[PDB]
Amino acid sequence: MNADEWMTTFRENIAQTWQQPEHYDLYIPAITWHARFAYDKEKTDRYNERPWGGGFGLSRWDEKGNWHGLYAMAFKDSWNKWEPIAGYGWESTWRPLADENFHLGLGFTAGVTARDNWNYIPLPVLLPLASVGYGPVTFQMTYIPGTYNNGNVYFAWMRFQFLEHHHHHH
Question: Which of 10, 38, 55, 160 is the S-S candidate for 73 at Cβ 3.0 to 4.6 Å?
Answer without folding.
Answer: 55
